[PDB]
Design a binder for this molecule. Sequence first.
Ligand SMILES: OCc1cc(Br)ccn1
Length: 129
Amino acid sequence: GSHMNPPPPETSNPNKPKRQTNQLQYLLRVVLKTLWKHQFAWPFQQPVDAVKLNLPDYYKIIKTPMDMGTIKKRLENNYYWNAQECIQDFNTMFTNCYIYNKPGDDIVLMAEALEKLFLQKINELPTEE
Ligand SMILES: OCc1cc(Br)ccn1
């Protein structure tokens, strides 16, 4: 896309260790699946396109961008070593939204609905086997 948007987060790197765990499988098959199909998921399914949205300060503020499209790719391509890495990516995505936007902005209410679902699912993250 535009040279004025940063490259997306890494989703492929042969030097990084990687493993399948039952917790990472749950994050794909239960958590990502549930959030992806939510009515309010669409703004979070790809990196923020700050050019198209006319937000030229976005990547001045948000220096740790993350989105569910990136997480989806990371889970499908087995990028992660453990569930904590993936959970941190979801938390980063939510907190970016809350940092950049005004409380009560539509995008914040949408993020909050996804986060409430997220928390319910993560409270049932299975014991690592
Ligand atoms: O206003 C910032 C923003 C825009 C979109 Br689309 C998704 C997440 N955050």
